């Protein structure tokens, strides 16, 4: 029979992988088409500095990266390991982003 | 087809993996896209208003970096 | 005959003094103000470059990078607080997995 | 074709300080990108606070006092002590230079 | 009347604002349309809050606004709550809110 | 005697507006301290924002334009729309007035 | 011959309705005042305090902690609970961003 | 006698009540006191700083209002 890992120990690698590196973890081209589609509602025919979209993405990631550090502490508090929309909804309400 | 979904389940996962998350409810993905999209709408609203104010048709790195100082999310290393 | 050298400061006493006059902070500006300010901005610059440069050396590297900044800052109690709401680009997070997600009996 | 317009920066000064502290330690461009936003942010904060201090005491002038006060307000403990130490030294040295 | 505030039709002081923007360390110079514009803005936000608090006083059989009537007009209008999100309104209390999982059956 | 320095407030213009929106209701001094703080908070917000606008475009002058922009940055959706509606209405009415 | 007592909870629920209805200051004013001076001394001795300044201190303390309880209750309810606890406080404060 | 104890158990309940709290741990009181003790030490360190800068020996309501705005917790009705 073949080797298989215990459902959890690869996520534990994935965590130690991604905390060690610094790269952007969203797909850059998708992020950019989204951004432009968001923007175009506020004003048609806008252009964008490549540095601008890469600034937007650097903040977008690091905020959500932090929201999941939070949302995980929310989940662990309810003696759980699985993050859930409630955990996000709490972190956001306790952060005052939500009310 | 309106991009939002391009922020992929694999991607969202990866972010969370950075942020200490070992296990991820399936409804998270759609939630996190509602979240990320609001966050963008508001940062971009600001940066574009700075743009409109400088009388421009191109957004700058600064328009963003200023916008994120007003949203309290001071970003280092892209000007200012 | 320069002001920075008269103060002993590697930062620009003058520029900082100009910046002050031009940044609409106050009507007038003392002559200690820019010396003091520059000196502080020397030291806070100096306090990070030490720790960052340790972390760089602790990565076996020569050249400090955004990661070697983030590490130094987030691993110093005080500085962390100081830049508490400050997204450092390309600097990541610290390695940290809450212990209730570790291995059972290890 | 033309010259590119001037964009000031602290980056020489940051190098100067970096080379006192760690003589065999360089720095990336992105890293400098950060150290520049760094200072410029903490200028904006210390000046801004000193600006409010004077305005609260109806003072026209931001002196060396309104900085020190704003430094104690903004910095953490041991950070602020040395910051008060090195700035106090700085003005002392410049006044006895004339 | 001869005064600017009466030119724009505005209760709030045009002249005062215009002097304060000079004396407040904002920018070297200040246009004559700025303080007019700002005065009208500060008037409106007053005028919404006083309209809404003035009704919170008409909810309590009072003819006088107190710090509570402000708090209620504020935290129940979504937009003013967002504006005054970091704002402690002294002697305002809190809004009446008990969670469902604390109530009885 | 004749002390207390002469301290300024917006309390009379809170009273003038109050009688427009509700002739027949009035306001505690405790309530007027909140209203006065409120005006003073938003004043300081809108001017600090307009300051930065003008600073960012290297503009020396704070025009009605900088405030319009700073309103839109600070107020939320429908509160912003009206604010600009009124403040533009004032300048249009005042340029008529000479 | 009935001794009609209230069930463990129902005067908690009234006490809620009550104090949310009201605005008056819930810490006793004298103890607070002395405490405020006991904190102050650790920075500067021989300090005087405007009456209204010490109200401005309290008004803030209460409305801070009133807030801190609201959120700390949502931390309890999250955990499937109704008793608030030290670990509900500290989570709110962490997520708020008050301690590392 | 540490005044802090003067922050009575029955006061601490009354606050919590206003916050929609129904049941309370007994340990809380000791945590609510140190939390409370932090909050003040920070605000009074600031309040006394403005005071020390104004050269006075009297702490004003303005010294508190400036400290509370520095701390994110801006206060109306004591001179904004
Ligand atoms: Ca569209
Ligand atoms: Ca669309
Ligand atoms: Ca000038």
CA–centroid distance, residue C19 to ligand 3 (Å): 13
Q: Three-state DSSP class for H75?
A: strand
- Between CA E67 and CA E86 the distance in angstroms is 17
> Taking the domains of chain E in order of start, what are their residue ranges?
4-102
* Measured CA distances, A22 to A61, A71, B24, D37, E42 (Å): 11, 21, 22, 19, 46
Number of CB atoms found within 10 A of residue H2's CB: 9
Q: G58 — contact with chain H (CB < 8 Å)?
A: no
Q: How far is C7 from chain A (nearest CA, A)?
A: 37
Rg (CA), chain H: 15
Interface of C with B (CB under 8 A): 66, 85-90, 92-93, 96-98, 101
What would the two tokens of residue E70 be?
């402000």
Q: C77 — contact with chain G (CB < 8 Å)?
A: yes
CA–centroid distance, residue E28 to ligand 3 (Å): 6
Residue of D nearest to H67 (CA): D73
Is D38's CB within 8 Å of C12's CB? no
- Please say whether the beta carbons of A51 and B63 come within 8 A: no
Is the domain C3-101 a CATH 3.30.360.10 member? no
Q: How far is E10 from chain H (nearest CA, A)?
A: 23
Total residues belonging to chain H: 80
Is A58's CB within 8 Å of C89's CB? yes
Up-side HSE of residue B26: CA atoms within 13 Å toward CB? 0
Residues with Cβ within 8 Å of B47's Cβ and at least 6 positions away in sequence, in order, are: A52, A56, B59, B63, B64, B66, B67
Q: H80 — contact with chain E (CB < 8 Å)?
A: no
- Between CA E62 and CA E57 the distance in angstroms is 5
- Between CA E31 and CA E34 the distance in angstroms is 5
Query: What is the secondary structure of D11-24 as a DSSP string?
Result: HHHHHHHHHHH-TT
Total residues belonging to chain E: 105
**The CATH homologous superfamily of the domain defined by E4-102:** Histone, subunit A (1.10.20.10)
Q: Is the dihedral of CA C14, C19, C21, C26 positive or negative?
A: negative
Q: Which of these, D72, D79, D67, lies nearest to D43 by C-alpha position? A: D67
Which experiment gave this structure?
X-ray
Give the CA-trace dihedral at D17, D18, D20, D21, to 10 degrees: 120
- Please say whether the beta carbons of E98 and G77 come within 8 A: no
- Please say whether the beta carbons of F36 and E65 come within 8 A: no
Q: Which of these, F42, G57, F8, lies nearest to D58 by C-alpha position? A: F8
Q: Three-state DSSP class for C88?
A: strand
Closest ligand to Cα E26: 3
Q: Which of these, A63, A68, A62, A65, lies nearest to A88 by C-alpha position? A: A68
What would the two tokens of residue F25 be?
């209701």
Helices G86-96 and H28-53, interaxial angle, to 10°? 40
Start-to-end CA distance of chain H, whole Å, equals: 36
SS (H, E, C) chain E: CCCHHHHHCCCCCHHHHHHHHHHCCCCCEECCHHHHHHHHHHHHHHHHHHHHHHHHHHCCCCCEECHHHHHHHHHHCHHHHHHCCCCEECCCCCCCCCCHHHCCC
Q: How far is G70 from chain E (nearest CA, A)?
A: 10
What would the two tokens of residue B67 be?
């916008």
E strand segments, G35-87: 48-49, 83-84
Closest ligand to Cα A42: 1
What would the two tokens of residue G23 be?
């605005």
Interface of E with D (CB under 8 A): 24-25
Q: Give Cα G65 distance to the centre of its chain.
A: 4
Up-side HSE of residue G72: CA atoms within 13 Å toward CB? 30
CA–centroid distance, residue G66 to ligand 3 (Å): 45
What would the two tokens of residue G28 be?
């006793």
Number of CB atoms found within 10 A of residue A66's CB: 18
Element spanning A65, H or E: helix A50-77
Burial class of residue D10 (count of CB atoms within 10 Å of its CB; 0-12, 13-18, 19+) = buried
What would the two tokens of residue H24 be?
């309370």
- Between CA E51 and CA H69 the distance in angstroms is 27
- Please say whether the beta carbons of A74 and G95 come within 8 A: yes
Number of CB atoms found within 10 A of residue A11's CB: 19
Residues with Cβ within 8 Å of H44's Cβ and at least 6 positions away in sequence, in order, are: G36, G39, G40, G43, G57, H59, H67
Start-to-end CA distance of chain A, whole Å, equals: 53
- Between CA A93 and CA G96 the distance in angstroms is 10
- Between CA E2 and CA E8 the distance in angstroms is 11
């Amino acid at each position: 029979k073949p080797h298989r890992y215990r459902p959890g120990t690869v996520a534990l690698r994935e965590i130690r992988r991604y905390q060690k590196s610094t790269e952007l973890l969203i797909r850059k081209l998708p992020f950019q088409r989204l951004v432009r589609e968001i923007a175009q509602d506020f004003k048609t025919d806008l252009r964008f500095q490549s540095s601008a979209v890469m600034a937007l993405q650097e903040a977008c990631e690091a905020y959500l990266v932090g929201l999941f550090e939070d949302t995980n502490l929310c989940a662990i508090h309810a003696k759980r390991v699985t993050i859930m929309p409630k955990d996000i909804q709490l972190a956001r309400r306790i952060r005052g982003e939500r009310a | 087809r309106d991009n939002i979904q391009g922020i992929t389940k694999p991607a969202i996962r990866r972010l969370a993996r950075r942020g200490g998350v070992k296990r991820i409810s399936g409804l998270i993905y759609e939630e996190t896209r509602g979240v990320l999209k609001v966050f963008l709408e508001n940062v971009i609203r600001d940066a574009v208003t700075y743009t409109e104010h400088a009388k421009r048709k191109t957004v700058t790195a600064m328009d963003v970096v200023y916008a994120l100082k007003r949203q309290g999310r001071t970003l280092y290393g892209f000007g200012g | 005959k320069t002001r920075s050298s008269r103060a002993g400061l590697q930062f620009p006493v003058g520029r900082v003094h100009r910046l002050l006059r031009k940044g609409n902070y106050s009507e007038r500006v003392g002559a200690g103000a820019p010396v003091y300010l520059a000196a502080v901005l020397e030291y806070l610059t100096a306090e990070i470059l030490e720790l960052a440069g340790n972390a760089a050396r602790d990565n076996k590297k020569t050249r400090i990078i955004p990661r070697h900044l983030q590490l130094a800052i987030r691993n110093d109690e005080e500085l962390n607080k100081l830049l508490g709401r400050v997204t450092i680009a390309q600097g990541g997070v610290l390695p940290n997995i809450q212990a209730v997600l570790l291995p059972k009996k290890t | 074709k033309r010259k590119r317009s001037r964009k000031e920066s602290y980056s020489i000064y940051v190098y100067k300080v970096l080379k006192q502290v760690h003589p065999d330690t360089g720095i990336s461009s992105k890293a400098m990108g950060i150290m520049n936003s760094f200072v410029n942010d903490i200028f904006e904060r210390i000046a801004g606070e000193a600006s409010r201090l004077a305005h609260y005491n109806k003072r026209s002038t931001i002196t060396s006092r309104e900085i020190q006060t704003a430094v104690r307000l903004l910095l953490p403990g041991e950070l602020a002590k040395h910051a008060v130490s090195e700035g106090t030294k700085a003005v002392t040295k410049y006044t006895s230079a004339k």
